[PDB]
Amino acid sequence: SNAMIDFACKEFKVEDVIKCALNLTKADLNVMKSFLNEPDRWIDTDALSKSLKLDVSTVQRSVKKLHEKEILQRSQQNLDGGGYVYIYKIYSKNQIRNIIQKIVQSWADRLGQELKEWENGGE
Amino acid sequence: SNAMIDFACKEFKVEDVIKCALNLTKADLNVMKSFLNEPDRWIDTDALSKSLKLDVSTVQRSVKKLHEKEILQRSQQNLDGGGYVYIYKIYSKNQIRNIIQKIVQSWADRLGQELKEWEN
């Protein structure tokens, strides 16, 4: 996007907000964007490392985190010699909305609790 | 209360967050504070201007804005000459929090919209 939003009378880049919520680096986000840009594909980290201009190790790191954060579905392509290579597919735009909103919601709850230590402690 | 909070990875003074929510200047906030300090006292605008060391006209605008926002209830004190002056009391402390939370919630609900429109 690069679009803009205003929360509590301060200016937010929407993607900074998404990086906050999901604890993403620039790179993790660009990896997430890569999946989002081809929603239906099953891609691997070797392919993706070529797809972007990045060392497999950092691509593996983003992809592991996203999988752990339930942004990414993970399957297996079994190989001729008996091994496997993990492949990933981004979940719907909607399984994900719920992840992010759960997180925004909790921010609102915490700010909530902090405000009532304001009154009872404000003297 | 001079305290800092973080929301969406940025730092806010909590009181700046209250000023934002309730749309208050600094005088406004100091007037609201007096009422929170005395949740039972009913007070008039003149007597409050004094205790706060602000000109009556300012106190007047704050108090009106807070009544408007249902932060304050209003009543009348009769005067010998047939007149009156408005007196004010700080609502339920559960009112205050519920008002601020519905607002903070609405900020949350809306930042939502701005995501259900980040790729669409």
CSV table of C-alpha atoms in Angstrom, one decimal:
chain,number,residue,atom,x,y,z
A,1,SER,CA,0.0,0.0,0.0
A,2,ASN,CA,2.3,2.7,1.4
A,3,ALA,CA,-1.1,4.2,2.4
A,4,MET,CA,-1.7,6.1,5.6
A,5,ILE,CA,-3.8,5.9,8.8
A,6,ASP,CA,-4.4,7.9,12.0
A,7,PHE,CA,-4.6,6.3,15.4
A,8,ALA,CA,-4.7,8.4,18.5
A,9,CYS,CA,-3.9,11.6,16.7
A,10,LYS,CA,-0.7,10.2,15.3
A,11,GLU,CA,0.3,9.2,11.8
A,12,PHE,CA,0.7,5.6,10.8
A,13,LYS,CA,2.0,3.9,7.7
A,14,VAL,CA,-0.3,0.9,7.4
A,15,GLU,CA,2.5,-1.5,6.7
A,16,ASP,CA,4.5,-0.3,9.7
A,17,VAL,CA,1.3,-1.3,11.6
A,18,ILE,CA,1.3,-4.8,10.0
A,19,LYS,CA,5.0,-5.1,10.7
A,20,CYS,CA,4.3,-4.3,14.3
A,21,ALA,CA,1.4,-6.6,14.8
A,22,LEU,CA,3.1,-9.6,13.1
A,23,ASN,CA,6.6,-8.6,14.2
A,24,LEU,CA,8.0,-8.6,10.7
A,25,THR,CA,11.2,-7.2,9.3
A,26,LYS,CA,11.3,-5.4,6.0
A,27,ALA,CA,12.3,-8.7,4.4
A,28,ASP,CA,9.6,-10.9,6.2
A,29,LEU,CA,7.1,-8.5,4.9
A,30,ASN,CA,8.4,-8.6,1.4
A,31,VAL,CA,8.3,-12.4,1.6
A,32,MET,CA,4.7,-12.2,2.8
A,33,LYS,CA,4.0,-9.8,-0.1
A,34,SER,CA,5.6,-12.3,-2.5
A,35,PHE,CA,3.1,-15.0,-1.4
A,36,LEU,CA,0.3,-12.5,-1.5
A,37,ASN,CA,1.2,-11.4,-5.0
A,38,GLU,CA,0.7,-15.1,-6.1
A,39,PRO,CA,-2.0,-16.3,-3.8
A,40,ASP,CA,-2.6,-19.7,-5.4
A,41,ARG,CA,1.0,-20.9,-5.8
A,42,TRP,CA,2.9,-23.4,-3.7
A,43,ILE,CA,6.5,-22.1,-3.6
A,44,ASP,CA,9.6,-23.3,-1.9
A,45,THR,CA,12.4,-21.3,-0.2
A,46,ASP,CA,14.9,-22.1,-3.0
A,47,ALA,CA,12.5,-20.9,-5.7
A,48,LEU,CA,11.6,-17.8,-3.6
A,49,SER,CA,15.3,-17.0,-3.0
A,50,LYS,CA,15.7,-16.8,-6.7
A,51,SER,CA,12.3,-15.0,-7.1
A,52,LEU,CA,13.5,-12.2,-4.9
A,53,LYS,CA,17.2,-11.3,-4.5
A,54,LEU,CA,18.0,-12.9,-1.2
A,55,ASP,CA,20.0,-15.5,0.5
A,56,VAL,CA,18.1,-18.8,1.2
A,57,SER,CA,18.9,-18.4,4.9
A,58,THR,CA,16.9,-15.2,5.4
A,59,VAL,CA,14.1,-16.4,3.2
A,60,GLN,CA,14.0,-19.6,5.3
A,61,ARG,CA,13.9,-17.4,8.4
A,62,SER,CA,10.9,-15.3,7.2
A,63,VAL,CA,9.1,-18.4,6.0
A,64,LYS,CA,9.6,-20.2,9.3
A,65,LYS,CA,8.2,-17.3,11.3
A,66,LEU,CA,5.2,-16.9,9.0
A,67,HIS,CA,4.4,-20.5,9.2
A,68,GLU,CA,4.7,-20.3,13.1
A,69,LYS,CA,2.4,-17.2,13.0
A,70,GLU,CA,-0.1,-19.1,10.9
A,71,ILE,CA,0.2,-16.8,7.9
A,72,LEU,CA,1.5,-19.6,5.7
A,73,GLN,CA,0.2,-23.2,5.0
A,74,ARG,CA,3.0,-25.8,4.7
A,75,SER,CA,3.0,-28.9,2.5
A,76,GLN,CA,5.7,-31.4,1.2
A,77,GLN,CA,7.0,-32.2,-2.3
A,78,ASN,CA,8.6,-35.7,-1.9
A,79,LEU,CA,11.8,-36.2,-3.9
A,80,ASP,CA,13.1,-39.1,-6.1
A,81,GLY,CA,15.9,-39.9,-3.7
A,82,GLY,CA,13.7,-40.2,-0.6
A,83,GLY,CA,13.9,-36.7,0.8
A,84,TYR,CA,11.4,-33.8,0.9
A,85,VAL,CA,11.3,-30.0,0.4
A,86,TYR,CA,8.7,-28.0,2.3
A,87,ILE,CA,6.4,-25.9,0.2
A,88,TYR,CA,4.2,-23.0,1.4
A,89,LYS,CA,0.9,-21.4,0.4
A,90,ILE,CA,-0.4,-18.2,1.8
A,91,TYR,CA,-3.7,-18.5,3.7
A,92,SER,CA,-6.8,-16.5,2.5
A,93,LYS,CA,-6.8,-12.7,2.9
A,94,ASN,CA,-9.3,-13.5,5.7
A,95,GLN,CA,-7.9,-16.1,8.0
A,96,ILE,CA,-5.2,-13.4,8.3
A,97,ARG,CA,-7.5,-10.4,8.9
A,98,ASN,CA,-8.7,-12.3,11.9
A,99,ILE,CA,-5.0,-12.8,13.1
A,100,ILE,CA,-4.2,-9.1,12.7
A,101,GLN,CA,-7.4,-7.9,14.3
A,102,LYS,CA,-7.1,-10.2,17.3
A,103,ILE,CA,-3.8,-8.4,17.8
A,104,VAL,CA,-5.1,-4.9,17.3
A,105,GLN,CA,-7.9,-5.7,19.6
A,106,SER,CA,-5.4,-6.7,22.4
A,107,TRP,CA,-3.6,-3.4,21.9
A,108,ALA,CA,-6.9,-1.6,22.5
A,109,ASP,CA,-7.5,-3.8,25.6
A,110,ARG,CA,-4.1,-3.1,27.1
A,111,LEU,CA,-4.4,0.7,26.5
A,112,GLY,CA,-7.7,0.2,28.3
A,113,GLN,CA,-6.2,-1.3,31.5
A,114,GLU,CA,-3.5,1.4,31.4
A,115,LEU,CA,-6.1,4.2,31.5
A,116,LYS,CA,-7.7,2.9,34.7
A,117,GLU,CA,-4.3,3.1,36.5
A,118,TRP,CA,-4.5,6.6,35.3
A,119,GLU,CA,-7.6,7.5,37.3
A,120,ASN,CA,-6.8,5.3,40.3
A,121,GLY,CA,-3.3,6.7,40.7
A,122,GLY,CA,-3.9,10.2,39.2
A,123,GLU,CA,-4.6,11.5,42.8
B,1,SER,CA,-0.3,10.6,34.7
B,2,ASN,CA,3.0,11.7,33.1
B,3,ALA,CA,3.2,7.9,32.2
B,4,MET,CA,4.0,6.6,28.8
B,5,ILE,CA,2.3,3.9,26.7
B,6,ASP,CA,3.1,2.3,23.5
B,7,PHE,CA,0.4,1.6,20.9
B,8,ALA,CA,1.2,0.0,17.5
B,9,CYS,CA,4.9,0.3,18.3
B,10,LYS,CA,4.8,4.0,19.0
B,11,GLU,CA,5.1,5.9,22.3
B,12,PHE,CA,2.4,8.1,23.7
B,13,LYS,CA,1.9,10.0,26.9
B,14,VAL,CA,-1.2,8.5,28.3
B,15,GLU,CA,-2.6,12.0,28.9
B,16,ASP,CA,-2.1,13.0,25.3
B,17,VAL,CA,-4.2,9.9,24.5
B,18,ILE,CA,-7.0,11.2,26.8
B,19,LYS,CA,-6.7,14.7,25.3
B,20,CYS,CA,-7.0,13.0,21.8
B,21,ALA,CA,-10.0,10.8,22.7
B,22,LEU,CA,-12.0,13.5,24.5
B,23,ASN,CA,-10.6,16.3,22.3
B,24,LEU,CA,-9.3,18.4,25.1
B,25,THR,CA,-6.9,21.3,25.3
B,26,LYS,CA,-4.6,21.4,28.3
B,27,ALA,CA,-6.8,23.7,30.3
B,28,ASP,CA,-9.8,21.3,29.6
B,29,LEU,CA,-7.8,18.4,30.9
B,30,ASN,CA,-6.8,20.3,34.1
B,31,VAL,CA,-10.5,21.2,34.7
B,32,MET,CA,-11.6,17.6,34.2
B,33,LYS,CA,-8.8,16.5,36.7
B,34,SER,CA,-10.3,18.8,39.4
B,35,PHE,CA,-13.6,17.0,39.1
B,36,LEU,CA,-11.9,13.6,39.3
B,37,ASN,CA,-10.1,14.7,42.4
B,38,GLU,CA,-13.5,15.5,43.9
B,39,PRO,CA,-16.0,13.0,42.4
B,40,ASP,CA,-18.8,14.2,44.7
B,41,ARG,CA,-18.2,18.0,44.9
B,42,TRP,CA,-20.7,20.2,42.9
B,43,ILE,CA,-18.9,23.3,41.8
B,44,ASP,CA,-19.6,26.5,39.9
B,45,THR,CA,-17.5,28.2,37.2
B,46,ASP,CA,-16.4,31.2,39.2
B,47,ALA,CA,-15.3,29.3,42.2
B,48,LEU,CA,-13.4,26.9,39.9
B,49,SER,CA,-11.6,29.6,38.0
B,50,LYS,CA,-10.1,30.7,41.2
B,51,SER,CA,-8.9,27.3,42.5
B,52,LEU,CA,-7.3,26.7,39.1
B,53,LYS,CA,-6.0,30.2,38.6
B,54,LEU,CA,-7.4,30.6,35.1
B,55,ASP,CA,-9.7,33.3,33.8
B,56,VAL,CA,-13.4,32.5,34.3
B,57,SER,CA,-14.0,32.6,30.5
B,58,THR,CA,-11.7,29.7,29.8
B,59,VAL,CA,-13.0,27.5,32.7
B,60,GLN,CA,-16.4,28.4,31.2
B,61,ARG,CA,-15.5,26.9,27.8
B,62,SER,CA,-13.9,23.7,29.3
B,63,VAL,CA,-16.8,23.1,31.6
B,64,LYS,CA,-19.3,23.5,28.8
B,65,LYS,CA,-17.4,21.2,26.5
B,66,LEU,CA,-17.2,18.5,29.3
B,67,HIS,CA,-20.9,18.8,30.0
B,68,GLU,CA,-21.5,18.5,26.3
B,69,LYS,CA,-19.5,15.3,26.3
B,70,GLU,CA,-21.5,13.8,29.2
B,71,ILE,CA,-18.3,13.8,31.2
B,72,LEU,CA,-20.1,16.4,33.5
B,73,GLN,CA,-23.6,16.6,34.9
B,74,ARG,CA,-25.1,20.1,35.3
B,75,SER,CA,-27.4,21.5,37.9
B,76,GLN,CA,-28.5,25.0,39.2
B,77,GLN,CA,-28.0,26.9,42.4
B,78,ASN,CA,-30.6,29.6,43.0
B,79,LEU,CA,-29.5,33.2,43.9
B,80,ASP,CA,-31.3,35.7,46.2
B,81,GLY,CA,-32.0,38.0,43.2
B,82,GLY,CA,-34.0,35.4,41.2
B,83,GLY,CA,-31.0,34.3,39.1
B,84,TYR,CA,-28.9,31.2,39.1
B,85,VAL,CA,-25.5,29.9,38.4
B,86,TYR,CA,-24.8,26.5,36.9
B,87,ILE,CA,-23.0,23.9,39.1
B,88,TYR,CA,-21.2,20.7,37.8
B,89,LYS,CA,-20.4,17.3,39.1
B,90,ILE,CA,-18.1,14.6,37.6
B,91,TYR,CA,-20.1,11.6,36.5
B,92,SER,CA,-19.7,8.0,37.6
B,93,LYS,CA,-16.1,6.9,37.2
B,94,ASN,CA,-17.4,4.0,35.1
B,95,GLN,CA,-19.0,6.5,32.7
B,96,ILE,CA,-15.6,8.2,32.1
B,97,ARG,CA,-13.8,4.9,31.3
B,98,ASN,CA,-16.7,3.6,29.2
B,99,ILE,CA,-16.6,6.8,27.1
B,100,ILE,CA,-12.9,6.7,26.6
B,101,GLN,CA,-13.0,3.0,25.8
B,102,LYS,CA,-15.8,3.2,23.2
B,103,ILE,CA,-13.6,5.8,21.6
B,104,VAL,CA,-10.4,3.8,21.8
B,105,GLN,CA,-12.4,0.8,20.5
B,106,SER,CA,-13.7,2.9,17.5
B,107,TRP,CA,-10.0,3.7,16.7
B,108,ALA,CA,-9.3,-0.1,16.7
B,109,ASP,CA,-12.5,-1.0,14.7
B,110,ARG,CA,-11.5,1.6,12.0
B,111,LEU,CA,-7.8,0.7,11.6
B,112,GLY,CA,-9.5,-2.6,10.9
B,113,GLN,CA,-11.3,-1.1,7.9
B,114,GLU,CA,-8.0,0.2,6.6
B,115,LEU,CA,-6.7,-3.4,6.4
B,116,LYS,CA,-9.8,-5.0,4.8
B,117,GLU,CA,-8.6,-2.5,2.1
B,118,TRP,CA,-4.9,-3.1,2.1
B,119,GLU,CA,-5.2,-5.6,-0.7
B,120,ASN,CA,-8.7,-4.8,-2.0
